[PDB]
Amino acid sequence: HAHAPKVIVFISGSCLFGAISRSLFKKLPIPYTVVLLILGAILGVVASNVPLVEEHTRDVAHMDPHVLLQIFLPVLIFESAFAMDVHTFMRSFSQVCILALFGLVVASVLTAVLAMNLFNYNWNFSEAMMFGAIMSATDPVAVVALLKDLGASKQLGTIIEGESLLNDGCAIVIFNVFMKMVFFPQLTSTVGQNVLYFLQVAVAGPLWGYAVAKVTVFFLSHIFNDALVEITITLAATYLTYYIGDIWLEVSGVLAVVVLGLIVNAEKTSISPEVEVFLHRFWEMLAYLANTLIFMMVGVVVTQKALVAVDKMDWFYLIILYLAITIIRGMVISLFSPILSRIGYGLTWRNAVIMTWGGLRGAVGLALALVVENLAGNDVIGSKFLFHTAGIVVLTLVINATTIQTLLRILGMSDISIPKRLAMAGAVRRIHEGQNRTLNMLKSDRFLADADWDIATAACEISDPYSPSPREFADMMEEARLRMLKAEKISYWKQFEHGMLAREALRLLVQHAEVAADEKDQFILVDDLKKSWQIKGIYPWLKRKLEDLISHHMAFEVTINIAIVLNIVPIIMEFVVQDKMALQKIEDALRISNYVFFVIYAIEAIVKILGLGRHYIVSHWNKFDAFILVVALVDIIIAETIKVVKLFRLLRGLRMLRLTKALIPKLILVVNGKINNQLSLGYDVGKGYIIGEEEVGKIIDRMVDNKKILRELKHISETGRLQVVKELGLLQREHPGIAVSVKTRQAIRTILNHSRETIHELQGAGLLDEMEAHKLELTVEIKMKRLMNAPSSIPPPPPENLLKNVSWLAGDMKLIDFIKARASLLHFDYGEVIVREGDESDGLFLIVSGLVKLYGKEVFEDYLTVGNVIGEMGVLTKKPRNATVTCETTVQVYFITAEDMNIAIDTFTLYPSLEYRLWRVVAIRIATPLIMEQMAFQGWTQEKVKLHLERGYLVDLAESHFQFNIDATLEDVILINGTAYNAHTREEIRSPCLISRTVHKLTFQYTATEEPRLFVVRNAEYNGPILD
């Protein structure tokens, strides 16, 4: 029937035309949007003659301005804000802000000045400012894609994209300001109201967006196993933010949406990953639909009613205007360069040329031009506006967008760096070799012997897409430095791929490594890393002040807070109503409520005095509460009989003020969260640097040739590691609870990661069904998300709980009581020596608080902190101290004398014997470096080695005093203590040593003073006899 929704046809047709254009013009330089404009023009000239087609284009080609703005702009702005890398955007926030705001102002003003003078149109400054704002908006989606692919600079892409976003947002604000002056003029008003309006649009808008964003990310972090709710909440939050901002609050909706998108992007962790990957594509699709629709409408309407009033002189104006805007953008960038080169990422002239030439115009400008076209009606201003906007869009998409690819080549930015070319060539060669191996495997298959191999080998091909003298010693120094930095980069990437680093920490470490590589003689400086864990002083100061500020039934204060929350609505409503109506009976009804609240507060007084008596008035909070109570009594009495300023105005304020007693704790939580978000990054960066240094120091050991170069590199590595360890140890002292929270979160994250890996292994091997594995995965996922809601500060466990959790005491209640009954807590001051080299191994130390320096043979200078234990080797092997222990802070330490430990060893024996557990804990630590040195030239990290060893066990060596080695079942064999010799060659192995694969059979002897111990790891599956 005639009532059908004909716009559906136009929307679907726009989708089909977009698909066709993106398919045909994929490899050509001309972007598909120009083809969409041409198709829209063809459709418009057809509709002008075929009446049937008009009906199917009328309802959308003549859409109302407000519908256009409210439906499309939220999509485009939110997609732009949500797609980009916010952290890099914030790391270059000053450059982007200076340009997108001040440069936008100057560019739009200069464009307006040009329009008022060059054009024969007698435009006033308001219309000229509308013209300038429309044409200062930018849409660099193509240029940013080219930069991202070619990798000239990842930061340049973010700078250009963020400038486009903030320029788009502020170009809509300016157009809104000047649209009212041109099409909705009003009586002139005061500078006071102008300032109020400026605040409303520029300051309140971002705050409204921030509030909605925080509420949204709050609710998102509590939604579990419900993707649809997350997606719908994102959609509704965006659209309601824009709508409530523009229509109800009259704040700048576009800026609110910008802030909302940026915040929701930064807080991505509150969104389940499978919903994040969906949302990215969802908003990309919505933006694509919006762009296609806008271009089709522009073509249709510009051919229908714009080009019918275009004069021969306008084209000259269009060309001059294109040149003018290009020159203006270049001049703005050059003029501000003296400032921008000194902040953020800096600038270089080639980057300036790229940023100037890449200023493509797009959908936002055309949407605003359509708004002007619709609002102007019969005035030629609308036709001229749309003509010039479309002309500039076409020229930039035909000239700039096509030549940008070649300009990157001319400016020397499209070149692929040699490291990337070598890596890609190696990867391609490896892929080809693997394909050859698979082909040889298949050619032996009986069921594939008749395959047409000429087609198969051709189809699967993957091709390269990029197709002691003084000088000599310094050259070797540079070689070693560069190769060390390369190894460190590889190590950081490997750490990230296993979840041991956050992407931010990985980025920091890699960026520092690359910065060092280009500069002369630079190794990664710890002083530059130090910025990652420097807590800004504002937050500790706020925490201390608030804790001072805040510092009997549990339900009472909650009840009173609820009472005040119930107060505020009646109290605020009553008096605005009383003023607005001037019924009196309604006024009386609300007035009566004061007595109810006064009764509640009298009950408060009675029941608080019940537990405090005269001491009630000591606390300042109680003093203020008493003041408000007495003032309420005064208000009632003066109500029975200058009236307003006491009765009515104080109720509004004194109520809402006394709520802060509950707010202060939540601000403490917020400050704790802010400190945590920095301390976690600091720990991640420091630990990543430590682990990378440990690995690379065992790569370089036989990868740089000359010994002196190796010694310099090792010295630098050690002097970095020690500083990082000391700094991270002192961080724990400054903020103990936040450090405990960080470390517990890391522990849970690692446990869940490995549990997920076991679930996937069980699924792949078929021991668990394809359905139930998903159920366990869902449980793991919901457990992972609840970490984001974990408290930012966890009170540090008391010392007895640290003793309860030592590795070799866990779960053995009787031994836990035995040690707890005999361990004595010794307190030591700064600079004291707990034990010294050569001292008899008189006992163990478990550090419950503080930091200690280990020094000994100057070769070994490590530090240890809370939770670490000292002296296990001494107590087990009865040999003097290996290092001197010095207190770098006030230190508490559980001391267990060696005699009590020997008694415990004697008295506690089972299959997991206490001596066995101690020796196992020592053996893993001894073996980890030993296995590292052999496999550092292969693809396993430190955590892989430690997990590989955890599967192992310690040989009894008394049930069989000789060890027979079987390659088919043993991955590695390590001698931890004592001496061993091969039964065949009688060659003695006299140190911590990996038993060489060539050895068949080890043998030993009974020498009590040096009784040997041996460690072994069986292959993934050796169902044979275990002999722990």
Swiss-Prot record:
Reaction(s) this enzyme catalyzes, per UniProt: Na(+)(in) + H(+)(out) = Na(+)(out) + H(+)(in)
Q: Where is this region: Interacts with the transport core domain?
A: 503-518
What result is annotated for mutating R881Q?
Abolishes cAMP-induced shift of half-maximal activation voltage of gating current
Q: Name one GO molecular function term.
A: protein homodimerization activity
Instruction: Indicate the impact reported for R649Q.
Output: Alters the half-maximal activation voltage of gating current. Shifts the activation of the transporter to more negative voltages
Alphabetized, the UniProt keywords read: Antiport, Cell membrane, Cell projection, Cilium, Fertilization, Flagellum, Ion transport, Membrane, Signal, Sodium, Sodium transport, Transmembrane, Transmembrane helix, Transport
Tell me how this protein sits in the membrane: Multi-pass membrane protein
Listed binding positions for 3',5'-cyclic GMP are G871, E872, M873, R881, N882
How activity varies with pH is as follows: Optimum pH is 6.5.
User: For the region Transport core domain, what residue ranges are annotated?
Assistant: 93-180, 313-411
SMART domains listed in its UniProt record: cNMP
SUPFAM superfamilies per the UniProt record, alphabetical: cAMP-binding domain-like, Voltage-gated potassium channels
Q: Which residues lie on this side of the membrane: Extracellular?
A: 50-65, 119-124, 180-190, 250-252, 308-312, 377-380
- Ranges for region cNMP-binding domain: 814-896
Q: Please list every transmembrane segment annotated in the UniProt record, as residue ranges.
A: 7-26, 32-49, 66-82, 93-118, 125-150, 154-179, 191-222, 227-249, 253-266, 274-307, 313-342, 349-376, 381-411, 554-582, 583-610, 619-641, 642-668
Can you tell me which residues bind 3',5'-cyclic AMP?
G871, M873, G874, R881, N882
Q: How is its activity regulated?
A: Gated by voltage and stimulated by cyclic nucleotides which shift the activation voltage closer to resting membrane potential. Not inhibited by common sodium:proton exchanger inhibitors such as amiloride.
S4 segment of voltage sensor domain as annotated region, ranges: 642-703
Q: Cite the domain annotation text.
A: The dimer domain comprises TM1-TM3 and TM8-TM10 regions. The dimerization interface is formed predominantly by tight interactions between TM1 on one protomer and TM8 on the other. It contains an hydrophobic cavity that accomodates phosphatidic acids likely playing an allosteric role. The transport core domain (TM4-TM6 and TM11-TM13) displays a typical sodium:proton exchanger (NHE) fold with a six transmembrane helix inverted repeat topology. It contains an Asn-Asp (Asn-237-Asp-238) sodium-coordinating motif characteristic of electroneutral NHEs.
Further notes on this entry?
The VSD and CNBD domains are not functional in mammalian SLC9 orthologs. In addition, the conserved Asn-Asp/Asp-Asp motif that coordinates sodium ions in NHEs is lacking in mammalian SLC9C1 and SLC9C2, suggesting alternative transport mechanisms and/or substrates.
UniProt subunit comment: Homodimer; the dimerization is stabilized in the presence of phosphatidic acids.
What task does this protein carry out?
A: Electroneutral sodium:proton antiporter that regulates intracellular pH of sperm along with capacitation and fertility. Activated in response to egg-derived chemoattractants, couples membrane voltage to sodium:proton exchange and transduces membrane hyperpolarization to cytoplasmic alkalization to cAMP signaling and ultimately to sperm motility.
What name appears for this protein in its UniProt entry?
Sperm-specific sodium:proton exchanger
Recall the taxonomic lineage recorded for the source organism. Eukaryota, Metazoa, Echinodermata, Eleutherozoa, Echinozoa
**Gene responsible for this protein:** SLC9C1
